Amino acid sequence: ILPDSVDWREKGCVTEVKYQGSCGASWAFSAVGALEAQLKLKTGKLVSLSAQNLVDCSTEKYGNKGCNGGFMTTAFQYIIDNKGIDSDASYPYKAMDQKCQYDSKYRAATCSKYTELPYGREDVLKEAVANKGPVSVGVDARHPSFFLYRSGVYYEPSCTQNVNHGVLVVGYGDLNGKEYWLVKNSWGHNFGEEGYIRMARNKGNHCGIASFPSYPEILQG
Numbered sequence: 001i002l003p004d005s006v007d008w009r010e011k012g013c014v015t016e017v018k019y020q021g022s023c024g025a026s027w028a029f030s031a032v033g034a035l036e037a038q039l040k041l042k043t044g045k046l047v048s049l050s051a052q053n054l055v056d057c058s059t060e061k062y063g064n065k066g067c068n069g070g071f072m073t074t075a076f077q078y079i080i081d082n083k084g085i086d087s088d089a090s091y092p093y094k095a096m097d098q099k100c101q102y103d104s105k106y107r108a109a110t111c112s113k114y115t116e117l118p119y120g121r122e123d124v125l126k127e128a129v130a131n132k133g134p135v136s137v138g139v140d141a142r143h144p145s146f147f148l149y150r151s152g153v154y155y156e157p158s159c160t161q162n163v164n165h166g167v168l169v170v171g172y173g174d175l176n177g178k179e180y181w182l183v184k185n186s187w188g189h190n191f192g193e194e195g196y197i198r199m200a201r202n203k204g205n206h207c208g209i210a211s212f213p214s215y216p217e218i219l220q221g
């Protein structure tokens, strides 16, 4: 029914890994990455979208607190309400809280809608990654093993389904009996597998990967 493996990087839909630094903006990076993939499918152009734009402008009205955390779903709502999000190049990432500096002149994407998936359904998530594109999700990253991850299929016994770090699922697969999720993180290229972490799949919603998945869309109309 579904493909055994997916890697949205192979279709040119994933921008370079970013470096969030001391600013807790992983929620913003999760959000732009998902929308970038929809933009590339829609327009044929791969352009990084401004995570800083979300940190500075999708704030209190959306329950977000910039470098102190946020949600991807209300980040998408902001983009809908704002009728735009800027390119990352026009509004680059500074890893701190700033005044909203959105400028419609440098709008690089829109958002028509977003969709949330039901908690813990890794089959429903697998289908969405296959059929819709990369999915924004939260994970439990509050473990030293996460910070220290270098390669392989990550499994942390003490992981919980409560989420606290925004990431982007750009794929899934199976490595020698270990089914994994392919996860784009925002800790630069030196983390994990060139900025990615492959996380255990179909192991009881391990680290909450499927706790709060969502994805945006950019419709023709």
Ligand SMILES: CC1(C)CCN(C[C@H](O)Cn2nc(-c3ccc(C(F)(F)F)c(CNCc4ccc(F)cc4)c3)c3c2CCN(S(C)(=O)=O)C3)CC1
Binding pocket: 026, 027, 030, 062, 063, 064, 065, 066, 068, 069, 070, 071, 072, 073, 074, 137, 138, 139, 161, 162, 163, 164, 165, 166, 167, 211, 212
């Ligand atoms: C629309 C509303 C008004 C606002 C959004 N609401 C979402 C709803 O509460 C569902 N939800 N979503 C998340 C969720 C999903 C992804 C991410 C991530 F990706 F960033 F990591 C995170 C982390 N950031 C949280 C955060 C947000 C603002 C802030 F300043 C500081 C921190 C949380 C959680 C929950 C319930 C409780 N969990 S938990 C402990 O894991 O069970 C966390 C619904 C009402």
